[PDB]
């Protein structure tokens, strides 16, 4: 009772033809592909009400679809443009059951006019200001993630091997490292706040983790530098007296 999409992000070049799959284990007759854009909510591209059937949504232009088996629903972009840059959402449902839609969990796709522009993030951590600690008896560590294109990162915090959610804020949007360049690179920051005693106890471990999603192994380059593949870049710091 899950609907799974094939990849959670993907990167592709202008003019290329793109294939996303969706799959579901509930024996559902109905499957739908939407896309999601800020300001525009969800817009239905295509749907299918049985194996081999298809029907245009409100915005099929540029797309084509393929329902081969009862379990699969593929969406196909005839030729990538930057207005197909979006979050793609699959959903499935049953004609008979009274349960409605089950949604997949997205695939973000970004389309660029030049594959050489994608980079991982370098991840630094900054340790608290001594002056905060004394004035408040708390301790804010800051993480920067920098030098990433495209904006595909997922930043988490880890404290003695267990991830944490209390005491954290991350920028909802990153800022543009270079605000003129059309395909400018990106930076993101987060914060982790803890009582200063926690910070003043070198038995405690903190790590800033930044999962990036770039090129898949199939993609093709040879610039001298590492192939910018999906990866986790961390940084860390220990407690301090």
């Amino acid at each position: 009772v899950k609907v799974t999409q094939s990849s959670r992000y993907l990167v592709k070049r202008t003019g290329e033809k793109v294939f996303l799959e969706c799959v579901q284990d509930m024996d559902h007759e109905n499957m739908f592909w939407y896309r999601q854009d800020p300001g525009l909510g969800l817009r239905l591209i295509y749907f299918s009400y049985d194996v081999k059937m298809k029907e245009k949504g409100d915005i099929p232009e540029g797309y084509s679809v393929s329902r081969e088996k009862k379990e699969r629903f593929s969406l196909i972009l005839e030729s990538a443009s930057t207005n197909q840059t979006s979050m793609y959402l699959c959903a499935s449902s049953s004609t008979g059951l009274p349960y409605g839609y089950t949604f997949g969990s997205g695939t973000r796709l970004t389309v660029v006019e030049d594959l050489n522009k994608v980079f991982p993030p370098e991840v630094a951590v900054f340790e608290p200001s001594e002056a905060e600690i004394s004035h408040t008896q708390k301790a804010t560590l800051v993480c920067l993630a920098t030098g990433f294109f495209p904006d595909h990162v997922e930043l988490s915090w880890w404290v003695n091997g267990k991830e944490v959610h209390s005491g954290v804020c991350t920028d909802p949007q990153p800022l543009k490292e270079q605000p003129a360049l059309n395909d400018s690179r990106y930076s993101l920051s987060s914060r982790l706040r803890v009582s200063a005693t926690f910070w003043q106890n070198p038995r405690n471990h903190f790590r800033c983790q930044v999962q990036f999603y770039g090129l898949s192994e199939n993609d093709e380059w040879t610039q001298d530098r590492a192939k910018p593949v999906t990866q986790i870049v961390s940084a860390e710091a220990w407690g301090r007296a």
């Binding site: 909510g41 239905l44 009274p98 997205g106 200001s129 804010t140």
Partner: protein
């Protein structure tokens, strides 16, 4: 199930205040309506649905909506907003009583909740972790939500907007923005600048 609109793509309300998210529909046939919420990181999830089973529908996370046929509306409300309500919200409509057959969504309302900072001691602080290379971040923190951080002017200096962290176990929340540059003539004590409080400590 013909169409839907959500007037107000962005609502910001104080923690504890009334939440109201608009939804209006047109339908040539009998409509069935649905509200979905999408939390920052995760996917879409049913908050509530209307079926011709009663007028005032009650849903998850403390929400409610009224199906008012005489205005073509199904507005989402919650009397007292919680930090954890921050999310994007979508109204949909279907011709099927269960939402099996195609849903038409509206355009979304982004909900932002404004923390009530209790005892603010605003300050700018210098952090440098001594791995020290192309390094010096400045933290402006513990300010009141009255205060907004304005963008950069020197285009080679970076400020991030304010963010809100909550140390649940100490029923304590606090706002912060970060600023940084590699430039040698750059100082925390003159890095932030705008809509800024005199009592800022250093």
């Amino acid at each position: 199930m013909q169409s839907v609109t959500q007037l107000g793509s962005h609502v910001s309300v104080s923690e504890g205040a009334l939440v109201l998210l608009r939804c209006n529909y047109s339908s040539s046939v009998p409509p069935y309506l649905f509200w979905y919420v999408q939390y920052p990181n995760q996917g879409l999830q049913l908050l509530l649905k209307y079926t011709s089973a009663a007028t005032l529908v009650k849903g998850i996370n403390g929400f409610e909506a009224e199906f008012k046929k005489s205005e073509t509306s199904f507005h989402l409300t919650k009397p007292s907003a919680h930090m954890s309500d921050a999310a994007e919200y979508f109204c949909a409509v279907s011709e099927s009583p269960f939402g099996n057959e195609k849903l038409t969504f509206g355009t979304g309302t982004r909900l932002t909740i404004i923390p009530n900072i209790q005892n603010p001691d605003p300050a700018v602080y210098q952090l440098r972790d001594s791995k020290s290379s192309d390094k010096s971040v400045c933290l402006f923190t513990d300010f009141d939500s009255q205060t907004n951080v304005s963008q950069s002017k020197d285009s080679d200096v970076y400020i991030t907007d304010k963010c809100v962290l909550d140390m649940r176990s100490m029923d304590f929340k606090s706002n912060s923005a970060v600023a940084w540059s590699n430039k040698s003539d750059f100082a925390c004590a003159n890095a932030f600048n705008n809509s800024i409080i005199p009592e800022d400590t250093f």
